[PDB]
Design a protein around this nucleic acid. Structure first.
Lengths: 50, 64, 96, 79
RNA sequence: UUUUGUAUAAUGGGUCAGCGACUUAUAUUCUGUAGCAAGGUUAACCGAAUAGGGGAGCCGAAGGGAAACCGAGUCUUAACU
RNA sequence: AGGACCGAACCGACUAAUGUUGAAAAAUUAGCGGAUGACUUGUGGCUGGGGGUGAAAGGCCAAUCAAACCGGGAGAUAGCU
RNA sequence: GUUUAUUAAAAACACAGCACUGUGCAAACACGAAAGUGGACGUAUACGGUGUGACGCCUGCCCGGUGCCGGAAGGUUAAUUGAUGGGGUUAGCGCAAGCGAAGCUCUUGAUCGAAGCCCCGGUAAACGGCGGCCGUAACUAUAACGGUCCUAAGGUAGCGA
RNA sequence: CUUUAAUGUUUGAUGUUCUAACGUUGACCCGUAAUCCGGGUUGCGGACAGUGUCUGGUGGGUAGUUUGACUGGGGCGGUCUCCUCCUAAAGAGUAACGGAGGAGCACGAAGGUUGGCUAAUCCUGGUCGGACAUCAGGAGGUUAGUGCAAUGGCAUAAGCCAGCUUGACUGCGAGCGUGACGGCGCGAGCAGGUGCGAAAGCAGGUCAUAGUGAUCCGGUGGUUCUGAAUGGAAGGGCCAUC
């Protein structure tokens, strides 16, 4: 699309990801969030966000 | 012509070992970010039809 | 197909449409039945001669329904957990 | 400066009074926007985000006819 | 006859004798009623005519799963819960 | 020399009355317009239904027309009488 | 002259006069699946069509909008051509990822593309449009005149209960 | 290899020159004292005509069709989904063009947690200072502040200061709750790994209530599912998702 949606991926080399929607018309900024990885069984920073 | 199976019902229902009919959920494949994950997990097991619609589905699928 | 308005449920659900396609072409044989093979021998390469469950069959399977009393002999096919144990309880043999 | 609109139904129901109860949770009255104007005084702990007079415990209600200020507590009767 | 409501000034209607509307078939559920029963039952065609032959045909007897596949058990699962 | 002025035959059918389930399925009485001509009439032919005819009015086309008549589709259809 | 047969003979239609527009000989224009016909035994001193209405004095200003016409370059774009990239298959260099070619094959469609339209101008005897405020003459009343505001431009002639 | 002077063979376009295609929209002769046709004979044009096409565009002269509703008939004005109060009859239930006002979002931070702080505003005095906005003092205030209507909560702060932080978790949920159903709310307790705190305990998103739309259609990814003679692939399913 053109509004886009976030697909934030595990930093532990896992294929695991999370999804979220975030408005860009207020400000454009990349998300740096800490989330659970069920394959290495820890909470880590997730990458490749919008 | 000899009374027909509604194929728009056949591709939407399977029959259970108790006479009732089992089906999928709507609003689940085009928007996925708008339900919280508790609601997401409770919409991974499927559903069965209630009496308010069974009394019509059992006539649209007469040979089921 | 009408309830005055708001659509029937059969027009407000997702389609999936996927099936076995093998079920209609599988001969499902019971221990309570089998009188078309008379407690003799069963092999899928000669089952057309007995025509049990039909003539346009591609698969054969025996299920635990009833009790068998005579030494029926199986050559290949499919037999379930309890069906094998019921055939052996009748002196019957399963050759694989 | 306008006409019509008045809201749908408010979606509330009051019944957690006298000796009302429950068998796993005492769900009480469905109430709005007040997190603890009655509030719990014993093992009847709860009253969460939905503001409903709900307790994480089973039994029937009791009223003590005193409160923290002002106001009046809600509790539960003997098992 | 309409209409909630008509002795109605609302609808018509002469005379008299005739004509003139809900009929029965298949499918199926409840209701009623018999026969058979873990078994009950064939179409066309033949035919000592509905019998006797004809089991292509029709119901009941297992379930879990999208399906592979499994089965008196089974899908989902790291899973005990 | 008259698409001359008036006016009979000849053509029209404007005005008033009568008749209006009539004597007449628009006829009669007395006026009025045109009357060698963008006039009229006998005979046989040609133009036909979204087609003719019309110097044009929803005027005219067989006692039928905002689409005539006749055989079939046809028992069109109807949150309707 | 023509006209609504039995509600209505005209102030309507039209010629004459004038503009506008199509047409050059196998005319345009027209019919008819077509053969065959009309225009025409016509040739522009001829033919098919729109408006206004003989005659006299006349024919206002506005082309910004919609329509029409003249101009020509370039843009956009369908047909068709088949570059670029990907999918099924797959050679081949890298541990592997990373990639990734020719053929068969599924898909895309770079690019070529008259005129219109966009642009510039023309056309109001095409469709149409023909605006505010302030000051100005010693009663009162109204402006022959400036200033500023709008714009495509703001009613000349003649007539007027 | 390339610039530059040329060039064969075809194929479009454009101009010119022919005549064997085609016409004759010229005539005579014959069939045949037939105004047509066809042939023949002789002239004249000419690869253009004359005839018939499909692609795509233009295409309303032609055809079929579409037409929101509410409601003292109707358009105009208001309104249709979602939210708060009064209407609402001192139970549950509840309405219109009743009386009024709002929303179709915004925040990884404005979220979670431990400690600290608690207001606002008026008034008197106060410095360039501008009644007042530096500041203190007095009164006063769960009607300040919060994001936003309204209502009501909020210090056991959800308001603002400091630090630490992501439980805005993957998988499940006893049992109860709104509704006709679709859609859906609360929740004892567990699994997998954690965050704040000295600790009990707190955390499965924001102060609670508004912040676009089903089936259907296409696309992206993982697959010891299926892919109908044996297979792959395309299509379909399961599990993810725009």
């Amino acid at each position: 699309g053109i509004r886009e949606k976030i697909k934030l991926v595990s930093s532990a080399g896992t294929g695991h990801f999370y999804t979220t929607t975030k408005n860009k018309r207020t400000k454009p900024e990349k998300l740096e969030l800490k989330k659970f990885d069920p394959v290495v069984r820890q909470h880590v920073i997730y990458k490749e966000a919008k | 012509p000899k009374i027909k199976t509604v194929r728009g019902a056949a591709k939407r229902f399977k029959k259970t070992g108790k006479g009732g009919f089992k089906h999928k959920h709507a609003n689940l494949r085009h928007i996925l970010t708008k339900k919280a994950t508790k609601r997401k997990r409770h919409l991974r097991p499927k559903a069965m039809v209630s009496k308010g619609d069974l009394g019509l589905v059992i006539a649209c699928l007469p040979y089921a | 197909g009408f309830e005055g308005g708001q659509m029937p449920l059969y027009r407000r659900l997702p389609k999936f449409g996927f099936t076995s396609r093998k079920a209609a072409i599988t001969a499902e044989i019971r221990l309570s039945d089998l009188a078309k093979v008379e407690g003799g021998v069963v092999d899928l390469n000669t089952l057309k001669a007995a025509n049990i469950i039909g003539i346009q069959i591609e698969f054969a399977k025996v299920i635990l329904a009833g009790e068998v009393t005579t030494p029926v002999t199986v050559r290949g096919l499919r037999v379930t957990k309890g069906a094998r144990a019921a055939i052996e309880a009748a002196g019957g043999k399963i050759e694989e | 400066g306008g006409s019509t609109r008045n809201g749908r139904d408010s979606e509330a129901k009051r019944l957690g009074v006298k000796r009302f109860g429950g068998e796993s949770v005492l769900a009480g009255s469905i109430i709005v926007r007040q997190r603890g104007t009655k509030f719990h005084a014993g093992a009847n702990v709860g009253c969460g985000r939905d503001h409903t007079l709900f307790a994480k415990a089973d039994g029937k209600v009791k009223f003590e006819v005193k409160g923290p200020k002002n106001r009046k507590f809600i509790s539960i009767e003997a098992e």
